[PDB]
């Protein structure tokens, strides 16, 4: 009955008896973790036991239930430290992630690696498997070294071992190997740690940020489909005006990624078929457990998931991504529209945006936006009632306060968009 | 079976995860 944080020193927040909505909780969480108002949209709530995400509009009526506050919408090579991968950036009037969000992503990466939510890739061969295990030890060294740098302690100061900083499956794999192999691994680890902390760390003056980035990039390369969600289905439909391809008799996978959009494939006993990138979707309809995604070319993808909740999770992912790369003020399905965005466009309120865009929007025309620093006020301060900074009259809603007191352009560019 | 006969008793190589500029 609480929202959990992967950060080291962040107590969870217990929920009392009452009605809640996922978005408000995500705001509280974003506030708790010093997350900027721009990056708040990247985060969502994950239901640990059912393995199902919550859409922003999902109502929680309160039993034991533990929800993880985590970054859901991810873009490979956001760090731009990859030459074989396309760069990711944000429109200027520049990087995707700030430090605050990056820290949380790092914590998240550690938790995922250890608890195997981010499982290691399968070995193409025995040596490759060994090499994967080696890289795991490397990751352990990275984690421990980061912890060392943060606490301003050195190697003689720290007591610990590699065992709680690797995937549990590998650890348990190791504990069943003979003594000599366990000894060997532990020694080799200790050597890696020693060398890294004696020479490399200061020879190149490796910062903490650098280690985080390294860790996460290694996560991208070392684990299965990192920063991606895969959905199973036994009934898949890909159709157009003159085509109607139905796949049936869970045998089919549909993957959603932030830099390739929606893809699908026959679940293996090779490569993914691209359906659509996000900007091409016009709308998404849900009927029961069935999701129907409509593209601009009148093409359609339709799939039947396990239930309604999973459909909500799926579309909420797709929708969030659409907001991330297409239009920051439009939504694709009413079933998962965040009340804020609805009330936003309903009252003609933009999103927090860089000023140049505001002044430009004002010049080529009163523009209403959101505070680029905090969630508490609209650039007018809203509370649990709407009013101005110096005002005393609590107008029950924005519309009322505005009545007694321009608009956002569809598919308009901004720093709220990721160029991929 | 042998105690030492497995990939871990190859010559230890620094993992690429710890490579820096």
Domains of chain A: 2-73 (3.10.20), 126-222 (no CATH), 229-336 (2.30.29.30), 347-403 (no CATH)
Under an 8 A CB cutoff, do B3 and A206 touch? Answer: no
Angle between helices A99-114 and A126-150 (to 10 degrees): 130
Chain A: give the shortest CA distance to residue B3, in Å: 7
CA nearest A220 in B: which residue?
A: B17
Q: What end-to-end distance do the CA atoms of chain B give, in Å?
A: 42
Chain A: give the shortest CA distance to residue B19, in Å: 8
- For residues A246 and A235, give the distance between their C-alpha atoms in angstroms, rounded to a whole number: 7
Identify which of B21, B17, B6, B5 has the alpha carbon closest to the alpha carbon of residue A129: B6
Under an 8 A CB cutoff, do B18 and A192 touch? Answer: yes
Buried b (16+ CB within 10 A) or exposed e, A92-113: eeeebbeeebbbbbbbbbbbbb
- Chain B positions touching A127 (Cβ under 8 A) are 7
- For residues A347 and A332, give the distance between their C-alpha atoms in angstroms, rounded to a whole number: 19
Residue A284 CA, chain-centre distance (Å), reads: 21
Under an 8 A CB cutoff, do A204 and B6 touch? Answer: no
Find all residues with CB under 8 Å of A384, minimum gap 6, and list them.
none
- Chain A positions touching B4 (Cβ under 8 A) are 180
Question: With contact defined as beta carbons under 8 Å apart, do A120 and A170 qualify?
Answer: yes
Chain B: give the shortest CA distance to residue A271, in Å: 27
Question: With contact defined as beta carbons under 8 Å apart, do A166 and A136 qualify?
Answer: yes
- For residues B20 and A93, give the distance between their C-alpha atoms in angstroms, rounded to a whole number: 33
- Using DSSP bridges, classify how beta strands A2-4 and A66-71 pair: parallel, antiparallel or unpaired: parallel
Resolution in A: 2.8
Find all residues with CB under 8 Å of A388, minimum gap 6, and list them.
A380, A381
The 3-state secondary structure of chain A reads CEEECCCCCCCCEECCCCEEEHHHHHHHHHHHCCCCCCHHHHEEEEECCCCEECCCCCEEECCCCEEEEEECCCCCCCCCCCCCCCCCCECCCCCCCCHHHHHHHHHHHHHHHHCCCCCECCCCCHHHHHHHHHHHHHHHHHHHHHHHHHCCCCCCCCCCCHHHCCCHHHHHHHHCCCHHHHHHHHHHHHHHHHHHHHHHHHHCCCCHHHHHHHHHHHHHHHECCCCCEEEEECEEEEEECCEEEEEECCCEEEEEECCCEEEEEECCCCCCEEEECHHHEEEEEEECCEEEEEECCCCEEEEECCCHHHHHHHHHHHHHHHHHHCCCCCCCCHHHCCHHHHHHHHCCCCCCCCHHHHHHHHHCCCCCCCCCCCCCECCCEECCCEECCCCCCCECCHHHHHHCCCCCCCCCCCCCCECC
3-state percent helix, strand, coil for chain B, nearest multiple of 5: 30, 0, 70
> Could you tell me the two tokens for A253?
């996978």
Identify which of A75, A42, A72 has the alpha carbon closest to the alpha carbon of residue A260: A75
- For residues A313 and A404, give the distance between their C-alpha atoms in angstroms, rounded to a whole number: 39
Residue A22 CA, chain-centre distance (Å), reads: 15
Identify which of A82, A41, A376, A37 has the alpha carbon closest to the alpha carbon of residue A217: A82
| Residue A229: strand pairing partners | A256
Interface of B with A (CB under 8 A): 3-4, 6-10, 12-18, 20-21
Identify which of A8, A122, A37 has the alpha carbon closest to the alpha carbon of residue A351: A37
Interface test with B, best of A133, A138, A148, A167 (most B CBs within 10 A): A138
Query: In Å, how far are A331, A340, A353, B12 from A358, measured between CA atoms?
Result: 22, 20, 7, 57
Interface test with B, best of A133, A134, A170, A216 (most B CBs within 10 A): A134
**Neighbour order of strands in the sheet with A2-4:** A13-14, A2-4, A66-71, A43-47, A52-53
- For residues A3 and A15, give the distance between their C-alpha atoms in angstroms, rounded to a whole number: 8
Interface test with A, best of B10, B15, B16, B20 (most A CBs within 10 A): B15
- Chain B positions touching A128 (Cβ under 8 A) are none
> Could you tell me the two tokens for A299?
């093409």
Which residue do the tokens 């893809």 mark?
A: A263
Chain A: give the shortest CA distance to residue B7, in Å: 6
Question: With contact defined as beta carbons under 8 Å apart, do A252 and A231 qualify?
Answer: no
> Could you tell me the two tokens for A193?
């740690």
Hey, CA dihedral for A177, A180, A183, A186, is it positive or negative?
negative
- For residues A107 and A271, give the distance between their C-alpha atoms in angstroms, rounded to a whole number: 31
Question: With contact defined as beta carbons under 8 Å apart, do A291 and A303 qualify?
Answer: yes
| Residue A230: strand pairing partners | A255
Angle between helices A126-150 and A179-195 (to 10 degrees): 50
| Residue A381: strand pairing partners | A377, A387
With vertex at residue A44, the alpha carbon angle to CA A43 and CA A45, rounded to the nearest 5 degrees, is 145
Which of B3, B4, B8 lies nearest to residue A130, judging by beta carbons? B8
Which of A127, A138, A222 lies nearest to residue B7, judging by beta carbons? A127
Angle between helices A208-222 and A99-114 (to 10 degrees): 50
Question: With contact defined as beta carbons under 8 Å apart, do A314 and A72 qualify?
Answer: no
Chain B: give the shortest CA distance to residue A130, in Å: 6
Find all residues with CB under 8 Å of A141, minimum gap 6, and list them.
A162, A189, A192, A193, A196, B15, B17, B18
CB atoms within 10 A of CB A45: 23
Counting every residue written for chain B, the total comes to: 21
Question: With contact defined as beta carbons under 8 Å apart, do A57 and A334 qualify?
Answer: no
The 3-state DSSP class for residue B3 equals coil
- Chain B positions touching A126 (Cβ under 8 A) are 7
Which of A126, A139, A200 lies nearest to residue B20, judging by beta carbons? A200
Question: With contact defined as beta carbons under 8 Å apart, do A237 and A246 qualify?
Answer: yes
> Could you tell me the two tokens for A315?
């579309």
Under an 8 A CB cutoff, do A130 and B7 touch? Answer: yes
Residue A34's region, left for phi above 0, alpha for psi from -120 to 50, else beta, is left
Under an 8 A CB cutoff, do A142 and B17 touch? Answer: yes
Phi, psi of A330 (to 5 degrees): -115, 150
Under an 8 A CB cutoff, do A192 and B14 touch? Answer: yes
- For residues A78 and A89, give the distance between their C-alpha atoms in angstroms, rounded to a whole number: 7
**Which residues does chain B break after (C to N > 2.5 Å)?**
none
- For residues A38 and A373, give the distance between their C-alpha atoms in angstroms, rounded to a whole number: 9
Which of B10, B17, B20 lies nearest to residue A218, judging by beta carbons? B17
Chain A: give the shortest CA distance to residue B4, in Å: 7
């Amino acid at each position: 009955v609480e929202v959990i944080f992967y950060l080291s020193d962040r107590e969870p927040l217990r929920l009392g008896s009452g009605e809640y909505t996922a978005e408000e909780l995500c705001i509280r969480a974003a506030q708790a973790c010093r997350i900027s108002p721009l990056c708040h949209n990247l985060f969502a709530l994950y239901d640990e036991n059912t393995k199902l995400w919550y859409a922003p509009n999902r109502t929680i009526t309160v039993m034991s239930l533990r929800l993880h506050y985590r970054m859901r919408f991810y873009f490979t090579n956001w760090h731009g430290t990859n030459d074989n991968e396309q760069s990711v950036w944000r429109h200027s009037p520049t990087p995707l992630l700030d430090a605050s969000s990056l820290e949380y992503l790092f914590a998240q990466g550690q938790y995922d690696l250890v608890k195997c939510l981010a499982p290691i890739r399968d070995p193409k061969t025995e040596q490759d498997g060994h090499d994967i295990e080696n890289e795991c030890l490397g990751m352990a060294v990275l984690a421990i070294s980061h912890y060392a740098m943060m606490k301003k302690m050195q190697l003689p100061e720290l007591p610990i071992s590699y065992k709680r900083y690797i995937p549990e499956t590998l650890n348990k794999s190791i504990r069943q190997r003979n003594l000599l192999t366990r000894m060997r691994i532990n020694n080799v680890f200790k050597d890696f740690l020693k060398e890294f902390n004696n020479k490399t760390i200061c020879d190149s003056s490796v910062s903490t940020h650098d280690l985080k980035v390294k860790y996460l990039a290694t996560l991208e390369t070392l684990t299965k489909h990192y920063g991606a969600e895969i959905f199973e289905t036994s009934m898949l439909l890909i159709s157009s005006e003159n085509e109607m391809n139905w796949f049936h008799s869970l045998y089919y996978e549909v993957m959603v990624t932030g830099n390739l959009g929606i893809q699908w494939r026959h679940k293996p006993n090779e490569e993914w078929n691209n359906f659509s990138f996000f900007p091409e979707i016009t709308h998404i309809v849900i009927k029961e457990s069935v999701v129907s995604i409509n593209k601009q070319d009148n093409k359609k993808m339709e799939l039947k998931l396990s239930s309604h909740e999973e459909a909500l999770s799926f579309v909420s992912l797709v929708d969030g991504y659409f907001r991330l790369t297409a239009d920051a003020h439009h939504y694709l399905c009413t079933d998962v529209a965040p009340p804020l965005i609805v009330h936003n466009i309903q009252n003609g309120c933009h999103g927090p945006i860089c000023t140049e865009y505001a002044i430009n929007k004002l010049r080529q025309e009163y523009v209403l936006r959101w505070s680029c620093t905090d969630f508490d006020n609209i650039l007018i301060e809203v509370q649990k009632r709407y009013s101005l900074h110096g005002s005393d009259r609590s107008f029950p809603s924005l519309g009322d306060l505005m009545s007694h007191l321009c608009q956002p352009k569809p598919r308009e560019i901004s720093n709220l968009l990721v160029a991929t | 079976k042998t105690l030492m006969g497995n990939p871990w008793f190859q010559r230890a190589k620094m993992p690429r995860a710890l490579d820096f500029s």
